[PDB]
């Protein structure tokens, strides 16, 4: 379980997590309590494996379409503000953390993605994605490029998709129906092919990624890029003259991006809820609270609304928020994770050539992609139970093992990426094959993962991986 | 080749 | 249900109960309210069974140990003392009344075994369980014996198994592994082998239980006795010359008793939780309430700073102190009564010649552990997993809504298929459960909800055990 | 002990 008398918290890499931790260090000058600020990777899947245990961080923070997920498998405390401070904050920044009409979280900054541009690479931004085949071809030509951005978050590559039809769950007088997905109109079809099509002219790479597109842009190789207001730091950094406008339109309709609402959950099984509490309202909620993170990676539109009118004077927030009109925010039901994984999936495949346009959505339409994870997964996590129930059956009721073995063993045990760790002693180090396969991968399986039983016979936390190479080409 | 290098950032942290 | 308007309270009869009842003729002085005292056999398993139902006692005494099993079925109410209340107590007190982080009653007193040794048989008591064996063979020629205490609860001979390695559930970093339970290792095997033995060669009798020890005792028939606090008081009347000493080392090692905090807790269902809360803080926990109890059955360390103050002079109380100190405080986690069925079973297993030291340990380890459960279970999540696979295999690439409650096993074993949003679902009850078996033939029902999730509660209501 | 444990059960399944 989590420590009693600090504070752990997660925050996305790509966040103001500097700030966040001068925030944390001043709520430590006053109440004595170590705050600590940290950014696992993948957090959002990292989250709900660890808290479901009672372990994990005291507060998190990720826009809210995961919490409704997190909340309604149990993980989430729920927070009571009192009236006074929900009128700090926009009445719908909390009608986003809010799960069967109880608030779940703490509303922070809205964010939406903007196209980014090179203001000497392009005095003006095209008003439409058709344009940018012919503006790639003339900066080309100047040994540059016309557009970067991450093509392996379906986050990035949304907008377009919805552009001209495609919606994740239909929203009809209050409910969202998931029966009723937009994955595979005509819509969806039209902008992913588009997408597509740009790539299979050269006009961009399916390799591109966050961290390739940032560096690309702020490098001055690339005139525009497609993110949110995390990235306008880096851009000042670079001295890119840069501005941040509206999204380019689709066949004439606006791109429309997917409004997150970034957000604070406090960890149900944390000992700390009274300090996590103290720490959001009276030291992070507040114009010095936010301005220190500000002043580290924008936030987008904040939800103190206080705060917002000095923002929302400059341009770039102003964009963002042109571009939030135009879009839609994200639902906070539980099935976006599902959504958002038939999605990436989709956009892979399709920008790879692993399958035609029409496959990827219709597989995203029918979720295929993580129903196939669920069947390899069912079949691990069955398998382990065996071995499990193997190894108590023979314990119990078997012959009477040495009278002089340990009492004291870490018990069958499947980790997150399918190794059934087996039954064993206090203090051994244990060896288990590499999996063959791991997320569209195949693992020389002759080399080994290794994992410590620790001499109080719980397994260690840490698994190593080190040794697992990769094989496909 | 760009998703194995993904995963070792996956195994790095697991 | 309770009667509104008197206090009905249970304690053991091996408790300090007519000094409890003059402090609730002082209550009843006071506010005109009957507070009626008993004192039931085997009170500890009567107050879940009539509990459970709306009746029974307001108030009831134990020591905390089963508290967390009555705070899970949700049969005590939640005790709230202001801060002024709680500085007057020790503060590793209220830790022994804590389950999950919620107070679930008031301590009163902390009791540890001691050896209790007669001065004029045994001016210098042993310091080792290994020298009994030659002092009991001494003492029969003088007609008398060495040893005799209770051996029918494993309380009494749990300091001796625990004295060379025995535990019962590991503590490691705030939290009690229920997986790794310490009943069978090398440790317990030697301290109950030693136990055994003193019985097959006649240094003590199996049947030798509570009353019959104590009597001895005070008859001046043995030299020694293990008891605690509560039973200072008849030796005071019998005026057998006794000192309270550490107990015996085994193998150079302390024992370790296990330590009781003496709490008392507040029946969920009863209607008189104001009376009890004001006859507990204004009445019993004072010098005069806790006085009043002490000069009927001395408590033991008890949990008020200002009165344990005196008592702490007391060489006996240093002794209890000294025990105490060498043991350990009680788990009060709700598997604490399978534990104890567990090691009771084992030791009088063991001593009638039933059964080895080593079947005897190995029952009470799988017992203690509860290990047909954990068996039951992965074998029930396998097969969970098992539907959700074929499950999968057909909608997918068998022959051609997005929206379903997903394969999930709820806490009882019951593993609810995959299924559609606003679907009521019906799934046998379970072959077993906690030891008793139903009737599967009748079902369970959890409703899909219309936005595909699960239901939270799960309708349970037509599994109906099967017995005689 | 049985008649008694199921009396427990019936508890644990009312809540869940
Ligand atoms: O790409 C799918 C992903 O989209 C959203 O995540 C955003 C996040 O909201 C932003 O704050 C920033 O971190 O970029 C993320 C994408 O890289 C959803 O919030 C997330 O749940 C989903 O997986
Ligand atoms: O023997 C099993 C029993 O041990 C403890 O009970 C003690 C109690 O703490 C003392 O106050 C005294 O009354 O004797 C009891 C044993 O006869 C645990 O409290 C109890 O739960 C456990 O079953």
């Known amino acids: 379980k989590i420590e009693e008398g600090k504070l752990v ?7 103001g997590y500097n700030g966040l931790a001068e925030v944390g260090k001043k709520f430590e000058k006053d109440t004595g309590i170590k705050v600590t600020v940290e950014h696992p990777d993948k957090l959002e899947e990292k989250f709900p494996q660890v808290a479901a245990t009672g372990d994990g961080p005291d507060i998190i923070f990720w826009a809210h379409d995961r919490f409704g997920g997190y909340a309604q498998s149990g993980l989430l405390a729920e927070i009571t503000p009192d009236k006074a401070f929900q009128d700090k904050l926009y009445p719908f920044t909390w009608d986003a953390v809010r799960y069967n009409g109880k608030l779940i979280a703490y509303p922070i900054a809205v964010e939406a993605l903007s196209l980014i541009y090179n203001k000497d690479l392009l005095p003006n931004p095209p008003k439409t994605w058709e344009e940018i085949p012919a503006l790639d071809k003339e900066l080309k030509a100047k040994g540059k490029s016309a557009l970067m951005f991450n093509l392996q978050e379906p986050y990035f590559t949304w907008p377009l998709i919805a552009a001209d039809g495609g919606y994740a769950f239909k929203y009809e007088n209050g409910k969202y129906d998931i029966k009723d997905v937009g994955v595979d109109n005509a819509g969806a079809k039209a902008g992913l092919t588009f997408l597509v099509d740009l790539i299979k002219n050269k006009h961009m790479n399916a390799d591109t990624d966050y961290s390739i597109a940032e560096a690309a842009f702020n490098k001055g190789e690339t005139a525009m890029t497609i993110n949110g207001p995390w990235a306008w730091s880096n851009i000042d950094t670079s001295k890119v003259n840069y501005g941040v406008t509206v999204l380019p339109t689709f066949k ?17 099984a944390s000992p700390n809820k009274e300090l996590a509490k103290e720490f959001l309202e009276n030291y992070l909620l ?3 609270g936010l301005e220190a993170v500000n002043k580290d990676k924008p936030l987008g539109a904040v939800a103190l609304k206080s705060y917002e009118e000095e923002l929302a004077k400059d341009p770039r927030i102003a964009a963002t928020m042109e571009n939030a009109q135009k879009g839609e925010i994200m639902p906070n039901i539980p099935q976006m994770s599902a959504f958002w994984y038939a999605v990436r999936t989709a956009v892979i495949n399709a920008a790879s050539g692993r399958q035609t346009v029409d496959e990827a959505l219709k597989d995203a339409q029918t979720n295929a992609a993580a129903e196939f994870a669920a069947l390899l997964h069912s079949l691990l996590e069955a398998n382990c139970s065996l071995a499990l129930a193997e190894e108590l059956l023979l314990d119990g009721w078997g012959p009477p093992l040495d009278p002089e073995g340990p009492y004291s063993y870490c018990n069958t045990t499947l980790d997150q990426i399918g190794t059934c760790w087996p039954r064993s002693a206090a203090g051994a180090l244990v060896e288990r094959p590499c999996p063959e396969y791991f997320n569209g991968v195949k693992y020389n399986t002759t080399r080994n993962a290794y994992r410590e039983c620790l001499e109080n016979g719980t397994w260690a936390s840490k698994i190593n991986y080190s040794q697992c190479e990769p094989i496909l080409d | 080749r760009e998703r194995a290098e993904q995963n070792r950032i996956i195994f790095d942290s697991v």
Not at chain 1, 9 to 15: A, F, L, P, S, V
Not at chain 1, 252 to 264: D, E, H, R
Request: hydrophobic share 35%; charged share 20%; net charge negative.
């Open chain 1, 252 to 268: 004439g309709q606006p791109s429309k991006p997917f409004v997150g609402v970034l957000s604070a959950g406090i960890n149900a």
């Open chain 1, 9 to 15: 918290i997660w925050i996305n890499g790509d966040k």
């Open chain 1, 286 to 288: 507040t114009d010095e």
